[PDB]
Symmetry: D2
Subunit: 123 residues, 4 copies
């Protein structure tokens, strides 16, 4: 059920569009379109989920990555989201993320932002 549950189009508090397909044994593939930052149009994403989650009430662990390069822009950075899908009537994907920019070693202390996103399904 997690495969059909995860598969679809999602948004979050920032108003992004996250389109993903969950494959039968753990793949995530899709596109991300960002409301903020140095971004336009869609970016490829790929990731993995637990395709046989626990049946005790726990969420389904998952993660995915976007590198912020597409055919028209390159922000020299990549974001990974790590979180869990919680199904039901008001399904959500609750995540934390790490956004690393390419930097010189001297500037590596300011390479990585951290935050959180909650996604809700729109389709």
């Amino acid at each position: 059920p997690a495969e059909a549950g995860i598969t679809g189009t999602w948004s979050d508090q920032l108003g992004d569009t996250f389109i993903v397909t969950a494959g039968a044994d753990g793949a995530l593939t899709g596109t991300y379109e960002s409301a903020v930052g140095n971004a336009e149009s869609r970016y490829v994403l790929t990731g993995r989920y637990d395709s046989a989650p626990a049946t005790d009430g726990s969420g389904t662990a998952l993660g995915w990555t976007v590198a912020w390069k597409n055919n028209s822009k390159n922000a020299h950075s990549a974001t990974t989201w790590s979180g869990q899908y919680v199904g039901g009537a008001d399904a959500k994907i609750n995540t934390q993320w790490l956004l690393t920019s390419g930097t010189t070693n001297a500037n590596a202390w300011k390479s990585t932002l951290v935050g959180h996103d909650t996604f809700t399904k729109v389709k």
Copy 2:
């Protein structure tokens, strides 16, 4: 190009993990991860993304990947994402931070996500 040649290969870290990765197809990472520690045995699939046209000013090459800790023999109901950068030169490294989320009930979500850092060196 040099980002693909630099990232592709077999990498280890201080914990003695084995990270086998190919970078190609204009931004895809694919490969397997074997964890020396934790609730893990043998290889797990990884997928991720990298910047396939990084800056040439001395900055590293941003990248990220995910492992869901389920394979054919074991399932730890969790996923790790690494977000970081590849830095070439005489001691080439992939410098990362990571988020490890376990599937939890809502009551236990506050304790769902570990954070840390890994530096990989090429074998």
Copy 3:
């Protein structure tokens, strides 16, 4: 000034914690924290710092604080830091992210640190 008046008070969060803090002396935070979850009972000492001359452009007021989880009742061999910002207005909040580090052996340091987020609202 308004940062002191805004931050000083009693606050709670989504878990039902009680955070009692005074902001004064040009940047000090002092008070007590009572945790609704985890290996914790009764009040713990907190100390921290805040920006006592924040910008006036609409941005929040940066702050952070620490609790070591030892008091006269219990010791959980761990400490949490919250780093975030106070945002005034109708619906004033302190928006934070946190790192909870437990004492571990070196070998187990990869499991030492949980990460998450808390939003505090004034009671």
Copy 4:
């Protein structure tokens, strides 16, 4: 042992100067002088540590905060370090940190940097 262990002058891989005093029941007080960022001269720090750590080889949990305002500069930000002191012939304080800048709510996604610092004692 943790009090004498922690108290002193420390540096890290960036070349900072961290001067701290650990009090018998858990206080940390001192100053921080930064090699990087929008910073000059000393800043106040305060934090907390576990004053009765485990004796099984585990580290001593601690954390502290700096708000980046002193008599001559204000970077409208605060960093919290969360980590553990490990004693012996190679004593270190191993940390992760969160650096939050005051932002508008629209820019909160880019308010918080994450990283790690390892301190070693100079005196």
